[PDB]
Amino acid sequence: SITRTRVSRLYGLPAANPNNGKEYYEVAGRFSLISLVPSNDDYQTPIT
Amino acid sequence: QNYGINLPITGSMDTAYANSTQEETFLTSTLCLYYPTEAATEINDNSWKDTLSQLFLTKGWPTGSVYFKEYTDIASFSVDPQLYCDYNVVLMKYDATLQLDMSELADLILNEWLCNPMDITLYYYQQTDEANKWISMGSSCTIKVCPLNTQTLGIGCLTTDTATFEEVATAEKLVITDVVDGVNHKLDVTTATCTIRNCKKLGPRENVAVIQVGGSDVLDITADPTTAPQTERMMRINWKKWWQVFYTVVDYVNQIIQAMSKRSRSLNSAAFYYRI
Numbered sequence: 001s002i003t004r005t006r007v008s009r010l011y012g013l014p015a016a017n018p019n020n021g022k023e024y025y026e027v028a029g030r031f032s033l034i035s036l037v038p039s040n041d042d043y044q045t046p047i048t
Numbered sequence: 049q050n051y052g053i054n055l056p057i058t059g060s061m062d063t064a065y066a067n068s069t070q071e072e073t074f075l076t077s078t079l080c081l082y083y084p085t086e087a088a089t090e091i092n093d094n095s096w097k098d099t100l101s102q103l104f105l106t107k108g109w110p111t112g113s114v115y116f117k118e119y120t121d122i123a124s125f126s127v128d129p130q131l132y133c134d135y136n137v138v139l140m141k142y143d144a145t146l147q148l149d150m151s152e153l154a155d156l157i158l159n160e161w162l163c164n165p166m167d168i169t170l171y172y173y174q175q176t177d178e179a180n181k182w183i184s185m186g187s188s189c190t191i192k193v194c195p196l197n198t199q200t201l202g203i204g205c206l207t208t209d210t211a212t213f214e215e216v217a218t219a220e221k222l223v224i225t226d227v228v229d230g231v232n233h234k235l236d237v238t239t240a241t242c243t244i245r246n247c248k249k250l251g252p253r254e255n256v257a258v259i260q261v262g263g264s265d266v267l268d269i270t271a272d273p274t275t276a277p278q279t280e281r282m283m284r285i286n287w288k289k290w291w292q293v294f295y296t297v298v299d300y301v302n303q304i305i306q307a308m309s310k311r312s313r314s315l316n317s318a319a320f321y322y323r324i
C-alpha cells in the first residue's frame with residue numbers, strides 16, 4: 001500500500017522496490033538436461 | 049617307491065583272478081552322497097540320515113563311512129564344489145532350462161582339471177589346445193572377451209572400451225569358456241566377485257558319479273560338438289518320490305561303485321606326477 005492514499009491492501013509485488021534492499025533473490029535446485037551431443041565413443045580414431 | 053618315472057608293467061595272461069575286493073573297499077572307504085535341499089524337504093524326516101546309514105550297513109558299509117552333504121541347488125553347488133570322499137555320488141535334479149549349467153557342473157566334477165591362476169588385468173590370454181578351457185566360478189561371474197590380431201589390436205572390439213567386448217558369460221555361478229585356440233584375447237571379468245582360472249582337462253575323475261534325477265540324456269561334458277559321450281559315471285533316474293530315489297541309490301550301491309574307481313590322481317602311487 002501507498003501512504004496518505006486510499007489505495008491499500010492490494011496483493012502483489014509493485015515495481016517500486018522489488019529488490020527490497022536484497023542484492024539478489026536466490027533459488028537453488030537440480031536441473032536435468034537430456035540432450036544429444038557429438039560423441040564417437042572413442043571409436044573414430046586412427047587404427048594405430 | 050619309484051615315484052617320478054613311468055615304468056612299464058609286464059603282466060601275464062592266465063594269472064588267476066583275485067577274490068572280490070568289494071567288501072574290503074566298502075569297509076575301508078568313505079561314501080559321500082550329494083543331494084539337493086528339496087530332497088530332504090520332501091522326505092520330511094529328521095532321522096532319515098540314520099535310516100540310510102543303517103540300510104547302507106545292511107549293504108556292507110560300516111556305519112560311520114557314508115556322508116550326506118546337502119546343497120541348495122545346482123547353481124549354488126557349482127561354486128567351488130569340494131568332493132573329498134573316496135566315492136562321491138551327486139543326485140542332480142534336472143531342469144530343462146539349466147542344461148548348460150548341468151553340463152558345466154558335470155564337466156567340472158566328472159573330469160580332472162589342472163588349473164593355473166589368471167590375471168586378466170595383466171596379461172592377454174590364449175588357449176593352446178582343445179584340452180584348454182577357462183573355468184570361472186563365483187557369486188556372479190560375467191566374462192567378456194576381445195580377440196586380438198597379430199598386431200594386438202582387437203577384432204570386432206576395442207581394447208580400450210570394454211563395452212564393445214563380446215559377452216560370453218553373464219551372472220554365471222560357474223562357466224567353462226572355450227574360445228578359438230591360438231588367438232590372444234583381452235579378458236573383462238567381474239573379478240570382484242568371481243575367480244577365473246586357465247585349466248586343462250587331464251582326464252576322467254573316476255571317483256565322482258552323477259545321477260540326473262528325472263530328465264533326459266542332455267549332459268555334454270565335452271566342448272567338442274561332434275562328441276556327447278555318456279560315460280558310466282553319469283546315470284539317469286526317473287522319480288516321483290525322493291525316498292524311492294534314495295532306496296534305489298542304496299540298493300544299487302554295488303553297481304554305482306562298480307561304475308567308479310579310486311581317484312587315480314589320489315593315493316600314494318600318483319606321487320610326484322601331480323598330487324600324492
Ligand SMILES: *[C@@H]1O[C@H](CO)[C@@H](O)[C@H](O)[C@H]1NC(C)=O
Nearest residue numbers: 064065066067068069070072
Ligand atoms: C579266496 O576265496 C577262496 C574261495 O572262496 C578261498 O578259498 C580263499 O581262501 C580266498 N582267499 C584267497 C587269498 O585266495
Ligand SMILES: [Ca+2]
Nearest residue numbers: 149220222223
Ligand atoms: Ca553356468
Ligand SMILES: [Ca+2]
Nearest residue numbers: 204205212213
Ligand atoms: Ca564388439
Ligand SMILES: [Ca+2]
Nearest residue numbers: 175227228229
Ligand atoms: Ca579353445
Ligand SMILES: [Ca+2]
Nearest residue numbers: 270271272275
Ligand atoms: Ca560336446
